[PDB]
């Protein structure tokens, strides 16, 4: 997440979709109001989202399933 983002690219699949997934996740924390799945460690929402993606807790299918569950 910091210095290098190569870890998350190999998990999402390509660079152009990682940006969209990370932005969608980060807007939830910044404005919507949600809690991180990882320790905050004094980071900005973009870096927290990248860390969550790197761990394996966030991708498109999970967000879609959660949105369906909410409604």
């Amino acid at each position: 997440a910091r210095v290098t983002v190569q870890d998350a690219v190999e998990k999402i699949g390509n660079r152009f979709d990682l940006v969209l997934v990370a932005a969608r996740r980060a807007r939830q924390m910044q404005v919507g109001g949600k809690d991180p799945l990882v320790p905050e460690e004094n980071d900005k929402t973009t870096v927290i989202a990248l860390r969550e993606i790197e761990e394996g807790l966030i991708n498109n299918q999970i967000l879609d399933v959660r949105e369906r569950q909410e409604q």
Partner: peptide
């Protein structure tokens, strides 16, 4: 914007 920041970090950063 958030998208611009993520594009800068993931595409144009000098470590890439």
């Amino acid at each position: 914007t958030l998208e611009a920041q993520l594009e800068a970090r993931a595409l144009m950063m000098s470590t890439n």
